[PDB]
RNA sequence: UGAAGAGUUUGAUCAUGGCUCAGAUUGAACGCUGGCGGCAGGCCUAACACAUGCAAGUCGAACGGUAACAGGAAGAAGCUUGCUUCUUUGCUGACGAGUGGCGGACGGGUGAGUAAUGUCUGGGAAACUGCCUGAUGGAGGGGGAUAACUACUGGAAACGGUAGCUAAUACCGCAUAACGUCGCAAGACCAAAGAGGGGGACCUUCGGGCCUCUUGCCAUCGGAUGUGCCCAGAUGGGAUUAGCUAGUAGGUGGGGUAACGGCUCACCUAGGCGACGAUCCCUAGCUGGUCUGAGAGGAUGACCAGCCACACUGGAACUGAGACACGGUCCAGACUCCUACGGGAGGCAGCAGUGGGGAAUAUUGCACAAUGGGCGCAAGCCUGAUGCAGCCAUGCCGCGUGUAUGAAGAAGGCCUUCGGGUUGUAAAGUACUUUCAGCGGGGAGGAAGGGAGUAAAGUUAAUACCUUUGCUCAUUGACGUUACCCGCAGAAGAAGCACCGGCUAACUCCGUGCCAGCAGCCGCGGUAAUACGGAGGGUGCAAGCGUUAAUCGGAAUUACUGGGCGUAAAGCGCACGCAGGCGGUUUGUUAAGUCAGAUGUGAAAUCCCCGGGCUCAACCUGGGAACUGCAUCUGAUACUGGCAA
């Protein structure tokens, strides 16, 4: 209304829909692995694991996995394929 | 209040003088003293218990000029010390500046002793005061100032000073208008009209 | 060292969980008389096998399920 | 956040300051971590109105926490 | 160093038992009265609604820049001529706006909600933590943008839309890849930001590269600090509240959080909880503490400190280490306001003010001096935090309003066989003093710092710079001619309020006449009232006094300390018995209860013990003890309990 930097609100409009896309690109790739898990495949679940492996990693370096989730969330999705193996 | 009224009329029904306009006069000299201060708003009889019990409480109270509060407070320091409660109280009561000066001959009247300290003519040590209560202690120095070895009121109270024994626990110097309060009071010899046991019963609930 | 707390099973049915009642001497405050003020806590057995009166050792830790913070550390004895 | 700071505890028109390590999210009169000192700006002669330690103004300033200008200038004049 | 009772039932009396008073207290109110000053406190209610003003910014040392101000230069004018005047130019001071970073998540206020995985005490384990700080290592090379700006163009404003351009410590790749992370392993995979000062040798198309320093940046592993999360125990009242529960209880496997968890789900089992009081109902922010009180206890939660919760109502999410951000956003809703009538805007439980409520609670004041807080590598700027001032006897404390002397003792009253008594040394009258107010005149101190120069004994360039050190110089004071101090006249300008029948100290004379009225209780008054009214007098307190309300005390009259039950208040009409409480006697064992010791902890504040500092005191303050307690660690075995015989 008056704020010193009420522009802060507009600035965050940018940084909330940037984040958004990066995360939802990451969520479409998790859906692509899961495809192959119901096919029994190690050849399309793994065209979607090592291909989101730099993804997942570089987005922890944008801090967008966050904190101790980001020391956890390269093991959480490792977990997946191992059941099937 | 500091009173400001008819001193000697009190004497009548006090049954004692306790230093009301001492300098030439005392009981039954140019005044009517030892009566009742009423026509028959008050006249002599057998007395009630409770009369006495209030009066004596005020006896001790009035010969220092202490208010309601103060003297009770002194009691709350006495019954906080693990020494003698009776002693302690009368010890604290004599720490008042006004009482000390009278007993260095400065003022012929108790009221006058306290009416000195008022006008700027008193001091203690190099400190100037105009406060009628102070912390008075062993090896203090009671000091008159410049323009108080000039007043003709002060000198005129040394008269009576030659006529009162003056305490032995203070040095007293009138020749340079000093004296030190070198050591603690004795009350081995002032409790001669003071029964501490009476008042401390009453104060107790 | 560690702390393990003497409870007595008194309700075992459910799989992998034993209900224990722990009786400690609580004193009254104003009237200074000790009493049994029993207090259930929900202990997780590794495999349920208990019942009633089984002195056990429990200890404080992380939860594993809701209303947990307790484990079985040893069965002192049994009485089922 | 915690900082070395001064902290009035004087009454009205009495500047008695106490050097505290205290919070900036509570206050200088609010939540203390600890005392560490006393200071007179008026340089009173009362019993221990100046203290400033050696041991905690050499340990919480180890992991960082800054002092004040009078203090800075006092380190030298107690020749610590 | 530690606690006392009195009056009041009755013709009289002794018990029993209620009633009342004397105490201490308050964010208190009221009535009357009102000299000063120091210290503290001051909307408790309608968390009702609010005009306005202020309370939330700052870095140019990341930027692209130049809107204003002022110079520098530049051409020029006037030749208003070597001095005035005009245009140009980001060059330089300096800075509008706009991009970028950090604060606005704090501080402040309020107690409405709230019987609480909320608070308090005591532990615990599976976590986070920007600002902070240690260590080691790094900061390589590219790209795409877009604000401002610009040209248009829409609205009354709010507030827009086109089209074009561009910067970065902004954005996104790419490279490099551990003491990294993930992965049993084999392996796989991920980072960036520079900006400043200065400079000798060189180079430059002369902007700079080179070099040296400095701050900032990136990573990895720690530490600090601060913060999530769990548990146990203590936390209010009502059974004219007895039955409760479906992510309910639990188990698998999924998913989610920073992390542990039905936090959430799919499936599976059908459990779980309850009278040691569930469920429900009433009421309440909680704590250190506070008040009172001999203590125990009860009551209580004002200022001050900590915790928690809330910000028009309701709901919701974003960025981030941090927010559901009081003065951020959005949505819905009721309010409220404006309008160009198309449409918009707003939320004082922030400060100061406003109106309404209420018994009652203050000024839209001054200021960055000082203390602290924020931004910034600095300078510097910002602050209803704060320091001050103001208003209010709301309270605590100090001092004063004069001292002396003065009698037949003055009139003037009042009472009086009318001898006088009382007011009364009181006055008059005499000297003696000017505190404090008032007037005139000085005036300490609260200031350390930063700023201009100089020394380096660092670092490098040997010099710079930067930081460091002392010195040198001009100064930093809002309060306010401050504390205080000197002089100046002149008792001058400075007392009131209640009460006097008994509890309870303190009466006479009149007027009134169970009327008037009085009254905490017991009770007063029927025409000779120590109780009503006036006067006179007397009494207690005193710049206050008295009244009320309110809480504890007395009241051991709810009683653990510390109570009764034949008849005073109280024993079920009488048995049986489940839960509960309780257990003869001897031995062995255990050590849970219990006893001992040890160790943490028991916030600051507060009490006390000892002890100081303000002209005293109020007030300020140091150190010790207390911190009764709790958990933990180790022993003891008499008693209590368990077990065994």
CA angle A9/A15/A21 to nearest 5° reads 140
Q: Do the two domains B7-93+190-203 and B94-181 of this chain adopt the same fold?
A: no
Contacts 24+ apart (CB under 8 A), D11-15: D15/D41, D15/D42
Instruction: Provide, in whole angstroms, the distance separating residue D71's CA from nucleotide E167's C1'.
Output: 45
- Name the nearest CA neighbour of B163 among B4, B1, B24, B18: B24
- Kindly indicate whether the domain formed by A1-85 is annotated with CATH number 1.10.287.1080: no
- Kindly indicate whether the domain formed by B94-181 is annotated with CATH number 3.10.290.10: yes
For residue A75, the tally of other CB atoms under 10 A from its CB is 8
**With contact defined as beta carbons under 8 Å apart, do B102 and B111 qualify?**
no
Instruction: Provide, in whole angstroms, the distance separating residue D28's CA from nucleotide E370's C1'.
Output: 15
Residue B95 — φ and ψ, nearest 5°? -75, -15
DSSP per-residue string spanning B141-183: -EEE-GGGSS-HHHHTTSTGGGGS---SSS---TTTT-----S
Instruction: Provide, in whole angstroms, the distance separating residue D13's CA from nucleotide E112's C1'.
Output: 38
For residue A7, the tally of other CB atoms under 10 A from its CB is 9
Q: Nearest nt (C1') to C14 (CA)?
A: E250
**With contact defined as beta carbons under 8 Å apart, do B125 and B141 qualify?**
yes
Domain boundaries in chain B? 7-93+190-203, 94-181
**With contact defined as beta carbons under 8 Å apart, do D20 and D38 qualify?**
no
What is the rounded distance in angstroms from the CA atom of residue B115 to the CA atom of residue B7?
14
State which nucleotides on strand E lie below 7 Å from a protein beta carbon.
1-4, 22-23, 38-40, 56-58, 99-104, 106-108, 117, 123-134, 171-174, 180-183, 188-192, 219, 223-226, 230-235, 249-252, 254-263, 269, 271-274, 276, 293-294, 297, 304-307, 318-321, 323, 325, 327-329, 345-347, 370-374, 385-389, 396-409, 414-415, 421-426, 432-436, 445-450, 470, 484-487, 495-496, 500, 503-508, 536-543, 545, 553, 560, 581, 592-594, 603-604, 608-613, 615-617, 619-623, 632-634
Task: Locate the DSSP E strands across chain D.
Answer: 2-8, 17-23, 32-35
What is the rounded distance in angstroms from the CA atom of residue C34 to the CA atom of residue B39?
75
Q: β-strand D32-35 against D17-23: which pairing, if any?
A: antiparallel
Q: Nearest nt (C1') to C30 (CA)?
A: E560
Query: Left, alpha or beta for B139 (phi > 0: left; psi -120 to 50: alpha)?
Result: left
Instruction: Provide, in whole angstroms, the distance separating residue D39's CA from nucleotide E335's C1'.
Output: 56
For chain D, the C-alpha Rg in angstroms (whole number) is 12
- Name the nearest CA neighbour of C21 among C44, C62, C49, C53: C53
What is the rounded distance in angstroms from the CA atom of residue B20 to the CA atom of residue C10?
91
Instruction: Provide, in whole angstroms, the distance separating residue C5's CA from nucleotide E645's C1'.
Output: 29
What is the rounded distance in angstroms from the CA atom of residue C6 to the CA atom of residue C55?
6
What is the rounded distance in angstroms from the CA atom of residue B139 to the CA atom of residue B182?
4
Domain boundaries in chain A? 1-85
Q: Nearest nt (C1') to B57 (CA)?
A: E505
**With contact defined as beta carbons under 8 Å apart, do B31 and B116 qualify?**
no
DSSP per-residue string spanning B63-103: TTT--HHHHHHHHHHHTTSSS-HHHHHHHHTT-SHHHHHHT
Tokens of B113: 């002793």
CATH class as words, domain B7-93+190-203: mainly alpha
**Which protein residue lies nearest to nucleotide E106, measured between its Cα and the C1' atom?**
D25
For chain B, the C-alpha Rg in angstroms (whole number) is 18
- Which residues neighbour A4 within 8 Å (Cβ) at sequence distance 6 or greater? none
Instruction: Provide, in whole angstroms, the distance separating residue B69's CA from nucleotide E42's C1'.
Output: 25
Cα–Cα distance list, B20 to B16, B31, B52, B97, D52 (Å): 10, 12, 21, 19, 58
Q: Nearest nt (C1') to B201 (CA)?
A: E4
Contacts 24+ apart (CB under 8 A), B111-118: B111/B3, B111/B7, B112/B157, B114/B65, B116/B153, B116/B154
- Last residue before each gap in chain C (C to N over 2.5 A): none
């Amino acid at each position: 209304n008056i704020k010193s930097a009420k522009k802060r609100a507009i600035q965050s409009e940018k940084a909330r829909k940037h984040n958004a896309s990066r995360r939802s690109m990451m969520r479409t790739f998790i859906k692509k692995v899961y495809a192959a898990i119901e096919a029994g495949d190690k050849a399309a679940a793994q065209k979607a694991f090592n291909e989101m492996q730099p993804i997942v990693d570089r987005q922890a370096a944008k801090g967008l996995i966050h904190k101790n989730k980001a020391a956890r969330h390269k093991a959480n999705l490792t977990a997946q394929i191992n059941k099937l193996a | 209040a500091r009173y400001l009224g008819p001193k000697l009329k009190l004497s009548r029904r006090e049954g004692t003088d306790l230093f009301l306009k001492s300098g030439v006069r005392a009981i039954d000299t140019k005044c009517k003293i030892e009566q009742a201060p009423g026509q028959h708003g008050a006249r002599k009889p057998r007395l009630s218990d409770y009369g006495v019990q209030l009066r004596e409480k005020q006896k001790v109270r009035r010969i220092y000029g202490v208010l309601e509060r103060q003297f009770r407070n002194y009691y709350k320091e006495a019954a906080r010390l693990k020494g003698n409660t009776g002693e302690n109280l009368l010890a604290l009561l004599e720490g008042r500046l006004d009482n000390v000066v009278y007993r260095m001959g400065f003022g012929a009247t108790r009221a006058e002793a306290r009416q000195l300290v008022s006008h700027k003519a008193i001091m203690v040590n190099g400190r100037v005061v105009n406060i009628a209560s102070y912390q008075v202690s062993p090896n203090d120095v009671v000091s008159i100032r410049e323009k108080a070895k000039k007043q003709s009121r002060v000198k005129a109270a040394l008269e009576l000073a030659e006529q009162r024994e003056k305490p032995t626990w203070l040095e007293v110097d009138a020749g340079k208008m000093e004296g030190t309060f070198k050591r603690k009071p004795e009350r081995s010899d002032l409790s001669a009209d003071i029964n501490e046991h009476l008042i401390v019963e009453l104060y107790s609930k | 060292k560690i702390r393990t707390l003497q409870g007595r099973v008194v309700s075992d049915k459910m799989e992998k969980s034993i209900v224990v009642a722990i009786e400690r001497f609580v004193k009254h405050p104003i009237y200074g008389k000790f009493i049994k003020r029993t207090t259930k806590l929900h202990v997780h057995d590794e495999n349920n096998e208990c019942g009633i009166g089984d002195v056990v050792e429990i200890r404080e830790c992380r939860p594993l399920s809701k209303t947990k913070s307790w484990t079985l550390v040893r069965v002192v004895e049994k009485a089922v | 956040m915690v900082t070395i700071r001064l902290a009035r505890h004087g009454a009205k028109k009495r500047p008695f300051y106490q050097v505290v390590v205290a919070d900036s999210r509570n206050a200088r009169n609010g939540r203390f971590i600890e005392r560490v000192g006393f200071f007179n700006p008026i340089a009173s002669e009362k019993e221990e109105g100046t203290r400033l330690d050696l041991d905690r103004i050499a340990h919480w300033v180890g992991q960082g926490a800054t002092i004040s200008d009078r203090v800075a200038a006092l380190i030298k004049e107690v020749n610590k």
